[PDB]
């Protein structure tokens, strides 16, 4: 679901979607450690998107990656500029467009909101 070079914060610092392993820890919606309990392989040929955010950061995700918005969970293919990514000043999505397919990968974490922080801006996203 996210491009492999997407940086993700960790209790020790930073990793990437390409490097993070089951049993590692990411950061949950409150910034506390949250365990990775499942993943996907690296997946090829999925339709990819760039999501640009108001904090000056951007994340490449596939069409079906899920995002927590004020309207509820939306997949990337349904994001619209103006929406925000929230955990319950929320960062705003400023643009969404298709981009050529790159390798992507998803992970699942075990906090009750099923959210982890992603990108250099530490934006909330859904597993
Ligand atoms: Zn840092
Ligand atoms: Zn699509
Ligand atoms: Zn994921």
Residue numbers in the entry: 1 to 88, 101 to 139
What did the publication describing this PDB structure actually write?
Inteins are intervening polypeptide domains that conditionally catalyze their own excision from flanking exteins, rendering a functional host protein. In M. smegmatis, DnaBi1 lacks a homing endonuclease (HEN) domain and is located in the ATP-binding P-loop, and its sequence and insertion site are evolutionarily conserved in some mycobacteria, including M. leprae. DnaBi1 utilizes a noncanonical mechanism known as class 3 splicing where an internal cysteine (C118), rather than a cysteine or serine at the first position of the intein, performs the initial nucleophilic attack.
We therefore set out to solve the structure of DnaBi1 bound to zinc to understand the precise nature of DnaBi1 splicing inhibition. The DnaBi1-zinc complex crystallized in monoclinic space group P1 21 1. The asymmetric unit consisted of five zinc ions and three DnaBi1 molecules (referred to as A, B, and C). Among the five zinc ions, one is bound at the molecular interface between molecule A and molecule B within the three DnaBi1 molecules in the asymmetric unit. Three other zinc ions bind to each DnaBi1 molecule in identical positions. These three zinc ions are coordinated by sulfur on C118, peptide backbone atoms (N and O) of V119, and the hydroxyl group (OH) of Y128 of each DnaBi1. Additionally, V119 and Y128 are found within a conserved splicing block of DnaBi1.
